[PDB]
């Protein structure tokens, strides 16, 4: 019953690989249910074509903002933003898919995939999914990041959907 979504990542047009995730809708519903419905394209907007604007080697990969493509907005399925579901799940290690909010109770479409144990985020960022396959794809696309987040190259979600 736990959704599984995927991302087909490209580096400057050239297809690179696939990254799937397991959405924990069992524990974090409104958040998980949110990510699934945007990974598919179930409303017209979603993550297809959007990119990872903020990648920081050894930390995480930020994406989910299809509107502004910088970090400003990005709408969810419930109009614009939504409250923090909970903090039951903690950023235990790399692969951990979490929401990239801007001050409590402001979750939209921005998420980040962890590339290391990031405990300091526990309690501030709503964890809701985890890379199932492709953590080596997220590693490659990580190399194309920097320190302030600037991408050394254009990383994109060339295609996305639900396989389960």
């Amino acid at each position: 019953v736990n959704p599984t979504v995927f991302f087909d990542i490209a580096v400057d047009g050239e297809p690179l690989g696939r990254v799937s995730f397991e959405l924990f809708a069992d524990k974090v519903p409104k958040t998980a249910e949110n990510f699934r419905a945007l990974s598919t394209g179930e409303k017209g907007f979603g993550y297809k074509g959007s990119c990872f604007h903020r990648i920081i080697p050894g930390f995480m990969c930020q994406g989910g903002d299809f509107t502004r493509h910088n970090g400003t907005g990005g709408k969810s399925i419930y109009g614009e933003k939504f409250e923090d579901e909970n903090f039951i799940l903690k950023h235990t290690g790399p692969g951990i898919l979490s929401m990239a909010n801007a001050g409590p109770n402001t979750n939209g479409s921005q998420f980040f995939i962890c590339t290391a144990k990031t405990e300091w985020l526990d309690g501030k960022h709503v964890v809701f999914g985890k890379v199932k396959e492709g953590m080596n794809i997220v590693e490659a696309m990580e190399r194309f990041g920097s320190r302030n987040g600037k991408t050394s190259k254009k990383i994109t979600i060339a295609d996305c959907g639900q396989l389960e």
């Binding site: 903020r54 920081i56 930390f59 995480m60 930020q62 903002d65 910088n70 970090g71 400003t72 990005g74 979490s98 990239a100 909010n101 801007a102 402001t106 939209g108 921005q110 980040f112 990031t118 300091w120 985020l121 501030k124 960022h125 987040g149």
Partner: peptide, 6 residues
């Protein structure tokens, strides 16, 4: 902007 810090 949105996003977690290190």
């Amino acid at each position: 902007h949105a996003g977690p810090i290190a």
